[PDB]
Design a protein around this ligand. Structure first.
Ligand SMILES: Nc1nc2c(ncn2[C@@H]2O[C@H](COP(=O)(O)OP(=O)(O)O)[C@@H](O)[C@H]2O)c(=O)[nH]1
Ligand code: BEF
Ligand SMILES: [Mg+2]
Ligand SMILES: [Zn+2]
Lengths: 113, 311
């Protein structure tokens, strides 16, 4: 019985960027893993369909960093309230284990068809 | 009675399958087998004891017992609907063992059964545990995988020091006869991982769910996503298997002219020394879903923990 993420994750907050340049103050959303280490967000989502890099804020003072993305995969991601399209880019350089925990949490515990 | 011989007739079906019971009636069968566990309570690669499975062997027309076992499993009812909505998607891959889901009258209820058709007696985790935890006074599981697959005979274990590499160097030839059973169970993992990605299934691949033919069979801890994005997690399957890929000399059919163990050897150019485009094609054929950069020439590596990985 090898189970993926036998304990769930939490946290959703802050922003990221859409224009490598812009990321003015509020672009897209970051998802999960405060990450014991400190802060390591596993995955990213968006209400839009245009995001090249993302200056996602982080702890300390040098929190600014280019948390860029890669070719996405979109889902219907039906909100309980109603339908809403959301394109899921993954953090550049994620490994197959983390993309398993993320997918397991936001699909099996959320309303997706 | 007739409530026992009816089970032997419902386990069968469209196939011929002249089965013989092994669990004394409609009861299960207890075995001691190797497993790879991780479930918030336990973790490790250890020999545990199984109790939820009834085994039925199979005899051919000449009425001789062959290597074919139907392993019907009793479990909860929410597993039944979940291992049938993931099997109905991964049923067209030729590297998946046939399943049969039904409901039977045990005593006073309708209890559900899941039957896997034509497995082998042992898994790939039983063969890996046997060669990595060797005891020369407790090696019954290894002296059977070696005789069932015509690697040696039962009179080979009578000579003393038959397990020794320095006194009997002929044991490296009895081990090398498992190299094509292991090489063909490496090509079926890459088919299963491809079929598991096109359908949207996410799950961890462990070696006790692939019998000694390459067929896969527990789909009870897998989740479902949108098709096209599936993530086979193969990291304790390849790593635990690695020491057996050179002991059994698995990739000795790659030296032949069509990867055929019958056709003659490949005659290479004598002035050739690079072999980088064939090193990157051997990684793609057998280790396709191993997610980490592989540098054939370790002069392009990134630290001393990458040199050790890529060498
Ligand atoms: N291949 C095979 N496996 C067997 C047999 N008898 C018992 N087993 C064990 O049964 C297990 C099958 O796993 P399964 O029942 O699908 O999953 P589980 O109930 O969640 O462990 C294998 O891991 C073996 O260790 C047999 O005849 N053939
Ligand atoms: F919990 Be078993 F791997 F179907
Ligand atoms: Mg299992
Ligand atoms: Zn390297």
């Amino acid at each position: 019985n090898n189970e993926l993420s036998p304990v769930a994750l939490r946290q959703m907050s802050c922003a990221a960027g859409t224009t490598q340049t812009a990321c003015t103050d509020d672009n897209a959303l970051a998802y999960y893993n405060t990450t014991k280490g400190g802060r390591f967000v596993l995955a990213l989502l968006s209400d839009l369909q245009d995001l090249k890099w993302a200056r996602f804020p982080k702890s300390d003072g040098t929190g600014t960093i280019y948390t860029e993305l890669e070719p996405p995969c979109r889902f219907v991601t039906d909100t309980p309230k109603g339908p809403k399209v959301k394109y899921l880019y993954f953090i550049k350089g994620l490994n197959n284990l983390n993309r398993g925990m993320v997918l397991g949490s936001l699909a099996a515990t959320v309303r997706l068809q | 009675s007739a409530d026992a011989q009816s089970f032997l007739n419902r386990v069968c079906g469209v196939s011929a399958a002249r089965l013989t019971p092994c669990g004394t009636g409609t009861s299960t069968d207890v075995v001691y087998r190797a497993f790879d566990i991780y479930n918030d309570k336990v973790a490790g690669f250890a020999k545990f004891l199984k109790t939820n499975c009834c085994r039925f062997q199979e005899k051919d027309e000449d009425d001789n017992l062959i290597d074919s076992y139907f392993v019907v499993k009793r479990h909860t009812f929410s597993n039944y609907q979940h291992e049938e909505t993931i099997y109905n998607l991964l049923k067209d891959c030729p590297a998946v063992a046939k399943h049969d889901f039904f409901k039977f009258r045990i005593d006073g209820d309708m209890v559900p059964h899941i039957s896997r058709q034509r497995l082998t007696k042992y898994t790939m985790a039983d063969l890996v545990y046997a060669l990595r935890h060797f005891d020369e006074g407790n090696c019954d599981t290894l002296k059977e995988i070696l005789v069932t697959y015509n690697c040696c005979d039962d009179d080979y274990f009578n000579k003393k020091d038959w397990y020794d590499f320095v006194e009997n160097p002929d044991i490296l030839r009895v081990y090398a006869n498992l190299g094509e059973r292991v090489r063909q169970a490496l090509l079926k993992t890459v088919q299963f991982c491809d079929a598991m990605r096109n359908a949207g299934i996410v799950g961890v691949l462990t070696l006790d769910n692939q019998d000694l033919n390459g067929n896969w069979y527990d789909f009870g801890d897998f989740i479902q996503t949108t098709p096209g994005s599936g993530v086979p997690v193969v990291d304790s399957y390849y790593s635990l298997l690695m020491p057996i890929l050179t002991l059994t000399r698995a990739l000795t059919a790659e030296s032949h002219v069509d990867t055929d163990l019958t056709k003659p050897y490949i005659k290479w150019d004598l002035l050739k020394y690079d072999f980088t485009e064939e090193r990157l094609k051997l990684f793609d054929r057998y280790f396709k879903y191993w997610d980490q950069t592989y540098h054939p020439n370790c002069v392009n590596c990134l630290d001393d923990r990458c040199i050790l990985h890529c060498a």
